[PDB]
């Protein structure tokens, strides 16, 4: 069942968080924060800029110094702190899910049952790794004793998008903190509020000051200050391809800091004639429409074998026509608004390109309502590979359905993109499932499902959908720096 | 193609191998070695007993001493020696395959193309791990530096069966030597000859003396001397369930040495109605008949869904009726003899139990020829779970075919055995393949194939088919002894 | 600080725990449980025997069936249950530490601050591994897809000693449960009480019924029923060498179940002339006297370089003369009783052998008090390697101090034992610390400390001190069974 | 001993290597290649540019296609090919060492005994990993089967410097090929010759065409074509900080290809008063002077405790005054030339800055000879942290020696650099060795030695000395791309 907050949500935490204390901006400037379902201002937040990032980095650098509490405490106690933070987020789950929905335009049902549960589970997963991060002893040639330390990197700047503010906050700080790093987090200008509430819980849990610093503010200002900072050792980012390129360039020009990126995609589904048809239609539908299409792994190209193409298209339209748009906090509402004017304009412009370029509009195709950034759920059939809605990430509720008959050809078409975040394969054939998934150039391939993401699985893109992996055992590698120590000895023995 | 030796095979190495020198038995006694296809003596071999094992253990213990060449050389040089040994076996492949066939009653085609290639590949695989065996550095609670050494165990006694003399020799010494152990090997009394030739190549490759010692001789004498020896750290064994129990008991009574066992099985195949029928028939046929049925992973219970049962039975009989029995060295011969009188008697007695207990004899069912331990390839249909040929490992060319209709029931029937070495599943359904293989209590489960064994895969039994794993990354664990070293330090840092 | 229970301890849980319900013994028989400090009966407990073990195994087998709640729940939820159990033990820490002290004769200060903290930390460590136990995907030769499952083994019988009842209970059930096994636990007849209280918390935490079963009772009865049971897949044991041999023999005779043993030791310390002398004296003192000497890793042979031998002996005697014997619940008491009459008699008989065989009695040497199994802390100097107190594990407060001058010789003397659980090295020289620790045949080697044991470190013996490892990453291997699944595919790609 | 080539070296391979065939440049242009010891031209080589890189990438992309020989062959056969290549380089060791010395200005003794042995050993190490690169099976939440493939990335562009042409060629292609990638290699314009000879051996070994392509040519032309290429998946680079920044920027602007860099350093040694003084002087001397100082790990800041500073300085000068300069092919010659005019000018300009800024010139300080880019081995004492020779990587035979008395302060001074490739610690104190090495921000820390690099150890920089690691188990991660495959199943079991 779906419990709700029984009193009005009151916003309390609006300031910059550095050394576990609340700071005004150095400039004194604040910026507004809006509800995307009403277009109304929720509150003002301190606007961080380069001078505020500079204060946060100095705090994170001090907290990382040899001999500091965060460097010297047991790894198991790092894990304890993360498990306590997860307990506190669970305590404030109603508050946090409500704030996430109100600020992010996110269905409250999903915010409470999915985002908040993913936050809690991911933190608990990360807490468990803290004292299980291990180096090696190595049988080097010669009379030496050689071991490795998988040390924390140091100060990690982490730039977060607006589509999953809480989940992405925990995906970033969970592994970084578990490995022993300190962090300077820059939440999306649209959605700083839940991150600042989590900062209050980081204080309450007892993390040493400066281990986690949060600087709300804008991208070209605070974000660029992070990417180009001379004392940040690593930057992690999730968001647009364009900013990703900006970050890697600024990183190259400044101090060659380590960079990992996750940059969205144009993820394809291949539905073979032998697929469980109803299962494939349902998973591909949710794959493209989840969170109003504002998901990096959106299943935005669905290739269906000709023998079943028309049935797939009809059943997808039937399912797309069943949505209730409105305020994401009202029960029964099944689609909320897009985040803001920029994304809203982008979706409408791409929908129009689909009409003009000759796609078949099966349903939707325009805006909705008198307030809020709402877009009708839209289905396009007979899409071809050269159309804009086939090539560009839309980040809206816009589904593309294509036909194929040659399996060889559709794999090339699925791979013919600079993106490569995820893919789906729907078939009952063992051999096809293994060989197709091996052939797709995508970081996660789902077979007979879609959008299944768990803390135990590494997640990240092939090609221009990004570099590096998050979560799972493998993701923790990107938050460590390996040191080899080689000691001369009189005689070694195996 | 299949090259052959162009001169008569001459036997040269017949003595006990200790400290890289050839020893007569302490007793002076020798024992005969026979060709199972002719029942004629090939040569005499020095008979090792407890006093000879005692000399070999003293040599292996000396070679393992701290400061010795084998303990102090680079791990990478241990690997070099193993790769050189593989090169030398490849050089003597014609000789070794011929000797293996003549002594072991093994088809020369298989001996040359399969056993010898598996020997060479497994050695090269093991050589690659030598300098990649690594311990850990561990973020222990408190102000300590903790690391682990994955040391060699020490002197490993290794008792080998007669069905795959060379392959089992390399499966044992490859990992043991790669990890840095020293070994005392006791080949089967039936088949000492190829092991002694390999000992000549261990000398030629340059292994330090005492690293590999080979003591030919009998089970209750030399083998029991190994299992009960007070200075052997580990015993590894492949052979009968009965001896396996004898070894573990003697190990418990003496010095609590580590024991790993592989003890054969009664491995089942489940063939669902949707299986590729011809593929399933061919793999199950070879699965049961390979090397005259003298294989631990023999597919000796084949459960076939009723809808296709009669077709499966007919096609299996058709395939079983196509064999040519004779001397395993003559080209075109496709089935050789059983190893000796004991195995021959055991197979005939079990075949007769099948007739008496009411199985349907589809073909074969008796002995063959005027010399050699030959048994007609035999197929039984309508087998039921209480018959002796359903319960006891036969180790002969005797195939059992059963029907089922309830998938739930046939999994229980497949699991209703104290054995658990391997199983096969034949289906085109993705879900069935994953769920059935997860549900079978067997160490290796093949899907739409059978008998696929490679150096990269751990191999071993569930339940009374044995303990521990051989080969793959996981197998190397059983040839190391973990030491934790914990050092007090003034202050640790992550 | 050291909080205490503010009301009398009342014993509640005295029955057999099977399927999360409390059972009387099948026989109806109960046995008494005593306080070793007073020799007074505390309560009666249901006496489990073979028929009760048979009920527990049937319950554990049912809970392990494919499709059961414990097999199908998320690994992460297995970890959740373990973290909840740790929370509950932390809640009942005062109760549990008091009961442990009263039943086990264990100083309350240590019981509360060390045993209970080790229980809580080890459980939390084990909970973190549950969803991080992973198999492999393997690049096998040929056109196949090969992966491994690291499955739970199944029903694990776990026999626990009386010296660390709670800690050993958690060391056994923590890893077993984290890996997904079900367990049948047989606590020491002397000390069943804390295990039965933990069983009440296993119920409260919500573990599915039959996942943990606890059968109090005696060794030759309930314990032998476990070792010889035909449907227990693995037995783990900590206790005497003699029973260890009995278990491995019964395991070999019955169903070849997997066995791991930890069997105590005769652990040596080597103190070089350059050692921090006061540091070495203090660590070696606690190493031998901890928990009245009833510790497997007791530092029961201390070899000290001649130049500093007399100073080491004097300082050790000074420290040994500072103890206060009495009831382990009274504050300020620094040594409690031995567990029972058998251990008490054994210690006194070995002390007398030391006197007769010519050791120098520096202090102690006899019993103490009018009630309770108390032994004066005893120090022997000028011990030689042939004396009984040099060879046999004493398990009492009896310290042996020896001199050496040849480092080569003292390493041989340190290694000249069938035991091999642990060792200590005290030196300021880098090279000596690495080379000596590499040369000692012991499972844990401490450098400039002793007795440092943490959940992150594998723990176990070389030689006759046992087989296998507990805790750390490596310990989890012994609670999994590896299954290789190899799937035929049309074409593989790297 | 040191064998030599008995006939004149004849240069044969001067063309671009693509698809295992020799190509002229698309332009027709060639460039000269010089001997740095004589300043004389050795031969002309085809000059590759963007059009040639484009041909090589197309070939490498074709060789990486699903279904190709390199994608479908057994991993073990990838390893076979690498071991065969190592055999062939060993066969041509005299030829290759001579060519390396003549083209690279590298002492023949080192070229034959060190570079060529490192090439052979590193290849054999890499060959062993090929079929031991494994993914995971993961106990994900929900009813799913999840596994990972550690796939090759794809086409890897690899830009090589002139100081270790062969060793760096093998460090790049060894791991890349072992993991299954295809490569486009751009050797230094100064030193293309040995790489082209190795290309002839790649053909001879039987690597499929297009797996290894080598495009000799210049940095701003062929190198920039690689860094900015839209179909190269990863670029690896070793060389200057400045080019490293250029590569990462071009990578960010083009296709966000993965980048790893190794960029030299300013590596410090800390010599405590208790150090073995002669051992520290010898290791620090070779650490700074190896290969005429043209080593990334040059020990270019040596901090010595005041009590022993003057003795360290004298002994270092004594050792530096014992060199024989001349042609690196003549026996007895112990220092060769610098690579070219640019490096030569840079060294002399930095030597002069040392004089002007007030360092104490102990020996050397100017050029040498009438031909060749020779520099006298130069020692500076009383260096301070603000001088250019303290801050800038010199890449010449120029040693800096500094004093300290505060250990806290000297660690800060050691860390006060944007570099971070390596460091050395010289002390006999266990605690100091562990705590100092933990505190240094450097990728490899040697204790009581220096410059010990082996194929089993990961190697790479902290901070602006680069990102990622090469060699060892950890280095192989950077040549794989992780794919998560998650399959819906009816019910999972642990
Ligand atoms: N890490 C090392 O081992 C190493 C090696 C060589 C030089 N260095 C440092 O660099 C300094 C300058 O030496 P250098 O000029 O010969 O080094 P460099 O970085 O310019 O040359 C190294 C490699 O990079 C190539 N390259 C040059 N410009 C390029 C560009 N725009 N794009 C892509 N590739 C390009 C070169 O052709 C060569 O293959 C040296 O003095 C030394 O301090 C370090
Ligand atoms: C034997 C040897 N001794 C050395 C002593 C002092 C300094 C450097 C040394 C060295 O470098 C190498 C070497 O091949 N490198 C390439 C890889 C990066 C490191 C340099 C070998 C080698
Ligand atoms: Cl992985
Ligand atoms: Cl495995
Ligand atoms: Cl370990
Ligand atoms: Cl590592
Ligand atoms: Yb369906
Ligand atoms: Yb010296």
mmCIF file of C-alpha atoms in Angstrom, chain D residues 137-251:
data_model
loop_
_atom_site.group_PDB
_atom_site.id
_atom_site.type_symbol
_atom_site.label_atom_id
_atom_site.label_comp_id
_atom_site.label_asym_id
_atom_site.label_seq_id
_atom_site.Cartn_x
_atom_site.Cartn_y
_atom_site.Cartn_z
ATOM 1 C CA UNK D 137 27.037 -13.922 -12.086
ATOM 2 C CA UNK D 138 25.195 -11.571 -9.772
ATOM 3 C CA UNK D 139 22.418 -12.261 -7.181
ATOM 4 C CA UNK D 140 20.294 -9.315 -8.309
ATOM 5 C CA UNK D 141 17.046 -8.426 -6.542
ATOM 6 C CA UNK D 142 13.965 -9.923 -8.220
ATOM 7 C CA UNK D 143 13.303 -12.984 -10.368
ATOM 8 C CA UNK D 144 16.142 -12.451 -12.849
ATOM 9 C CA UNK D 145 19.347 -14.133 -14.001
ATOM 10 C CA UNK D 146 22.083 -11.493 -14.283
ATOM 11 C CA UNK D 147 25.604 -12.009 -15.612
ATOM 12 C CA UNK D 148 28.305 -9.705 -16.918
ATOM 13 C CA UNK D 149 30.580 -9.992 -19.945
ATOM 14 C CA UNK D 150 33.986 -8.339 -19.726
ATOM 15 C CA UNK D 151 34.141 -7.693 -23.460
ATOM 16 C CA UNK D 152 36.998 -6.053 -25.347
ATOM 17 C CA UNK D 153 36.390 -2.336 -25.857
ATOM 18 C CA UNK D 154 37.110 -2.343 -29.581
ATOM 19 C CA UNK D 155 39.598 -0.296 -31.601
ATOM 20 C CA UNK D 156 42.328 1.084 -29.309
ATOM 21 C CA UNK D 157 44.643 3.858 -30.499
ATOM 22 C CA UNK D 158 47.996 3.644 -28.733
ATOM 23 C CA UNK D 159 50.558 6.470 -28.873
ATOM 24 C CA UNK D 160 54.067 5.434 -27.781
ATOM 25 C CA UNK D 161 57.103 7.528 -26.651
ATOM 26 C CA UNK D 162 60.778 7.245 -27.723
ATOM 27 C CA UNK D 163 62.445 6.403 -24.387
ATOM 28 C CA UNK D 164 61.326 2.750 -24.198
ATOM 29 C CA UNK D 165 60.025 2.014 -27.707
ATOM 30 C CA UNK D 166 59.822 -1.781 -27.451
ATOM 31 C CA UNK D 167 58.796 -2.060 -23.797
ATOM 32 C CA UNK D 168 56.029 0.519 -24.229
ATOM 33 C CA UNK D 169 54.870 -1.184 -27.442
ATOM 34 C CA UNK D 170 54.431 -4.448 -25.547
ATOM 35 C CA UNK D 171 52.931 -2.756 -22.469
ATOM 36 C CA UNK D 172 50.256 -1.390 -24.802
ATOM 37 C CA UNK D 173 49.549 -4.256 -27.220
ATOM 38 C CA UNK D 174 50.004 -7.090 -24.678
ATOM 39 C CA UNK D 175 46.990 -6.298 -22.474
ATOM 40 C CA UNK D 176 44.895 -4.871 -25.325
ATOM 41 C CA UNK D 177 45.306 -8.008 -27.437
ATOM 42 C CA UNK D 178 44.944 -10.373 -24.483
ATOM 43 C CA UNK D 179 41.531 -8.810 -23.762
ATOM 44 C CA UNK D 180 40.510 -9.163 -27.423
ATOM 45 C CA UNK D 181 40.837 -5.572 -28.679
ATOM 46 C CA UNK D 182 42.327 -4.465 -31.994
ATOM 47 C CA UNK D 183 44.947 -1.717 -32.011
ATOM 48 C CA UNK D 184 46.251 1.201 -34.073
ATOM 49 C CA UNK D 185 49.765 1.987 -32.751
ATOM 50 C CA UNK D 186 51.611 5.259 -33.413
ATOM 51 C CA UNK D 187 55.264 4.861 -32.363
ATOM 52 C CA UNK D 188 57.426 7.885 -31.649
ATOM 53 C CA UNK D 189 58.667 9.657 -34.765
ATOM 54 C CA UNK D 190 62.194 9.266 -33.360
ATOM 55 C CA UNK D 191 61.908 5.478 -32.896
ATOM 56 C CA UNK D 192 59.603 3.659 -35.319
ATOM 57 C CA UNK D 193 62.052 0.926 -36.329
ATOM 58 C CA UNK D 194 61.725 -1.757 -33.643
ATOM 59 C CA UNK D 195 57.919 -1.484 -33.716
ATOM 60 C CA UNK D 196 57.902 -2.198 -37.455
ATOM 61 C CA UNK D 197 60.131 -5.220 -36.921
ATOM 62 C CA UNK D 198 57.683 -6.478 -34.288
ATOM 63 C CA UNK D 199 54.896 -5.973 -36.834
ATOM 64 C CA UNK D 200 56.716 -8.442 -39.106
ATOM 65 C CA UNK D 201 56.622 -10.941 -36.223
ATOM 66 C CA UNK D 202 52.914 -10.301 -35.603
ATOM 67 C CA UNK D 203 52.345 -11.399 -39.204
ATOM 68 C CA UNK D 204 54.653 -14.416 -38.756
ATOM 69 C CA UNK D 205 52.900 -15.502 -35.547
ATOM 70 C CA UNK D 206 49.577 -15.633 -37.407
ATOM 71 C CA UNK D 207 47.503 -12.841 -35.846
ATOM 72 C CA UNK D 208 44.435 -12.210 -38.034
ATOM 73 C CA UNK D 209 44.883 -9.214 -40.339
ATOM 74 C CA UNK D 210 43.903 -5.865 -38.868
ATOM 75 C CA UNK D 211 44.279 -6.975 -35.248
ATOM 76 C CA UNK D 212 47.519 -4.928 -35.012
ATOM 77 C CA UNK D 213 48.171 -1.936 -37.264
ATOM 78 C CA UNK D 214 51.219 0.319 -36.907
ATOM 79 C CA UNK D 215 51.296 3.820 -38.399
ATOM 80 C CA UNK D 216 54.681 5.543 -38.023
ATOM 81 C CA UNK D 217 54.614 9.311 -38.237
ATOM 82 C CA UNK D 218 54.451 12.534 -36.259
ATOM 83 C CA UNK D 219 52.465 13.669 -33.238
ATOM 84 C CA UNK D 220 50.416 16.669 -34.392
ATOM 85 C CA UNK D 221 49.568 14.698 -37.552
ATOM 86 C CA UNK D 222 49.111 10.961 -37.019
ATOM 87 C CA UNK D 223 48.820 11.204 -33.235
ATOM 88 C CA UNK D 224 46.179 13.928 -33.376
ATOM 89 C CA UNK D 225 44.319 11.904 -35.996
ATOM 90 C CA UNK D 226 44.078 9.096 -33.434
ATOM 91 C CA UNK D 227 43.000 11.239 -30.492
ATOM 92 C CA UNK D 228 40.228 12.921 -32.487
ATOM 93 C CA UNK D 229 39.081 9.908 -34.530
ATOM 94 C CA UNK D 230 35.333 9.252 -34.451
ATOM 95 C CA UNK D 231 35.661 5.435 -34.573
ATOM 96 C CA UNK D 232 38.490 4.781 -32.101
ATOM 97 C CA UNK D 233 36.944 3.585 -28.826
ATOM 98 C CA UNK D 234 39.943 4.168 -26.559
ATOM 99 C CA UNK D 235 43.275 5.986 -26.713
ATOM 100 C CA UNK D 236 46.221 5.100 -24.453
ATOM 101 C CA UNK D 237 49.229 7.394 -24.245
ATOM 102 C CA UNK D 238 52.618 7.703 -22.563
ATOM 103 C CA UNK D 239 54.603 10.924 -22.932
ATOM 104 C CA UNK D 240 54.445 14.570 -21.979
ATOM 105 C CA UNK D 241 51.901 16.254 -19.721
ATOM 106 C CA UNK D 242 51.200 18.794 -22.477
ATOM 107 C CA UNK D 243 50.262 16.218 -25.121
ATOM 108 C CA UNK D 244 48.291 14.277 -22.526
ATOM 109 C CA UNK D 245 46.091 17.331 -22.046
ATOM 110 C CA UNK D 246 45.840 17.689 -25.835
ATOM 111 C CA UNK D 247 44.688 14.090 -26.207
ATOM 112 C CA UNK D 248 42.028 14.257 -23.483
ATOM 113 C CA UNK D 249 40.699 17.490 -24.970
ATOM 114 C CA UNK D 250 40.527 16.077 -28.507
ATOM 115 C CA UNK D 251 38.901 12.948 -27.091
#
